[PDB]
Ligand binder design. Structure first.
Ligand SMILES: Nc1ncnc2c1ncn2[C@@H]1O[C@H](COP(=O)(O)OP(=O)(O)O)[C@@H](O)[C@H]1O
Ligand SMILES: Nc1ncnc2c1ncn2[C@@H]1O[C@H](COP(=O)(O)OP(=O)(O)O)[C@@H](O)[C@H]1O
Ligand SMILES: [Mg+2]
Ligand SMILES: [Mg+2]
Lengths: 328, 328
């Protein structure tokens, strides 16, 4: 009786890590194959159940209801890509503690490819296939990619130059298409190959964690975005926003990830979109004209951290967006 | 009775892949903890033993003689770094079929770090520690990084620009310090953090495979090189060469990896160094002034492809280099 999309919410518990494996480390998450339910168990102060649009069990290979990367795409990813081609603005963000599997989910591995390349691959096949199915229609892909870190935005695709003075982009406002980053490089991409190249580039340009030997900063959020324009004399374009958020564990190096929580809170139970760069840039995706999905990633061992992730996810089911179809 | 270093040869069999795992896929490699022996078994035309400087069993976690990434470094990597700081030119190359674990070994994972970052970390700790142990001495690190692909050399650290006309560097010859790449960017690096940044950049700049969704070209060789200069009014520099070769399976897109074989062959049982770009640039690491290691990577399932890798590794034991200590 009103037109609002609910934020699609989905959880994915990952497999034990060698570190934990070592410890005969306990597992405190259970997902029902049938009901889409996730249960936080009590390790040997209480047991909690939740229901989500999907509860992805990616914790044990040999389980009957195991959820592969392909299976995650096939549920969430693909359907959202449909919406994009039907001219919706899409947005999927991975949220959860560091090491919960946000990056694995979104990006995955060379031979374990996650949401993003999946989408890319899917996308281009469609375009290719929509040649002789619909020859008076044709497509046009640009990709852009940036991370926020310490309330600073940097263009992950921009060339980088030794004796580095790291260079930050400005955030400004389309009176019609929301907030955006002033001057972010957007790169026309003709194929999978080309796209997944710029993906790889941008990626190795992220902030390096100094805590691991060899990692991306656990406190950097990254936004990969595919703008997709369909031309028929007349054309319209949708934009695919795909986000790998900074870990959630219990300018300021924090502001963004914490005030994000404040937003989701506002939108369920003045939304403080502008109290942070990330939330301001995603203002539209979290309540503007966006078909939007949250993927709560959870560790199978961490009790309070998982309980938090879950609480948010639960709270985020209540958010409603005003998702439309674009045209010019 | 003559001063030649033997090429150090080492092999590492990796764990099954999920794909193989699926198949109850057979395992045909066996390493003796005690003797450094590797045996190619007969699947259920013959059984073949070999001995190497080390035979790394990285195929099953719960095994008593399992070889971690850390343990691979602690054998090969460290000793070699020692040689570097003593002023030797080092070079370690990974060789084997695609998917054998070359990249995993050399580079590894964010939380599975291989040879390279390990080396970088070790290196910088030494320098840090050699502050107040030896304050009249101090160090100076530059990193450079390039891949060869289709007999083309490209500067993986050079900035890259949209509407990309991919840009190839030239090969010219130091009448004194061998072959080298004319104008390759070398980047002074002040810390672990700085170096492993530039590693990540260069990396995401490699050629994209179009066979996988999301991968580096199985046919690109990458040469990561750390030039380390020790200053005392007087200084000298050694260079660490770390190589992730193109796979070995059954300008021309092949020339390099195949004529490499022809070289190793020449040096054991006119060495055709210049018949390819790769072998010409490594001319020096393969028989010049270089302490040098080969790491043969092998799949635990692939019979002929492993037998070939092994054949070469066996043959490479015979190579002797003319490894010195440098000074100016
Ligand atoms: N769903 C999964 N199943 C098995 N292993 C996983 C899964 N997700 C992540 N991993 C592994 O766990 C580690 C942490 O994953 P990562 O995606 O970096 O977490 P985060 O992005 O939250 O830091 C990585 O080694 C990753 O490969
Ligand atoms: N030693 C190992 N133990 C367990 N898994 C491995 C090992 N080496 C490689 N793998 C996995 O096998 C796959 C192929 O490894 P990779 O290094 O890419 O081989 P190559 O570089 O020869 O293509 C990767 O997913 C890698 O993470
Ligand atoms: Mg991550
Ligand atoms: Mg590789």
């Amino acid at each position: 009786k009103d037109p609002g999309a609910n934020v699609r919410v989905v959880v994915r518990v990952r497999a034990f890590l060698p570190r934990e494996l070592e410890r005969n480390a306990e597992c405190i998450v259970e997902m029902d194959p049938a009901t889409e339910r996730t249960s936080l168990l009590v390790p040997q102060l209480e047991e909690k159940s939740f229901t989500f649009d999907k509860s992805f069990w990616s914790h044990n290979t040999e389980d009957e209801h195991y959820a592969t990367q392909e299976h995650v795409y096939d549920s969430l990813g693909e359907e959202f890509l449909d919406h994009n081609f039907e001219g919706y603005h899409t947005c999927i963000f991975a949220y959860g503690q560091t090491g919960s599997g946000k990056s694995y989910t979104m990006m995955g591995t060379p031979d374990q490819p996650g949401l993003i390349p999946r989408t890319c691959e899917d996308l281009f096949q469609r375009i290719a296939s929509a040649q002789d199915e619909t020859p008076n229609i044709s497509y046009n892909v640009k990709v852009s990619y940036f991370e926020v870190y310490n309330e600073h935005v940097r263009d992950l695709l921009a060339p980088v130059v030794p004796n580095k003075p790291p260079y930050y982009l400005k955030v400004r406002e389309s009176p019609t298409e929301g907030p955006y980053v002033k001057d972010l490089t957007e790169v026309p991409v003709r194929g999978l190959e080309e796209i997944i190249r710029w993906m790889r580039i941008g990626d190795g340009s992220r902030t390096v964690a100094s805590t691991k030997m060899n990692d991306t900063s656990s406190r950097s959020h990254a936004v990969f975005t595919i703008m997709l324009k369909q031309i028929h004399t007349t054309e319209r374009s949708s934009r695919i926003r795909l986000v790998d958020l900074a870990g959630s564990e219990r300018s300021n190096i924090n502001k963004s990830l914490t005030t994000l929580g404040r937003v989701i809170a506002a939108l369920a139970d003045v939304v403080p979109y502008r109290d942070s760069v990330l939330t301001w840039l995603l203002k539209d995706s979290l309540g503007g004209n966006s078909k939007t999905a949250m993927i709560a990633c959870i560790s199978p061992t961490d009790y309070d951290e998982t309980l938090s992730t879950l609480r948010y996810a639960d709270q985020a089911k209540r958010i409603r967006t005003r998702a439309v179809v674009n045209q010019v």
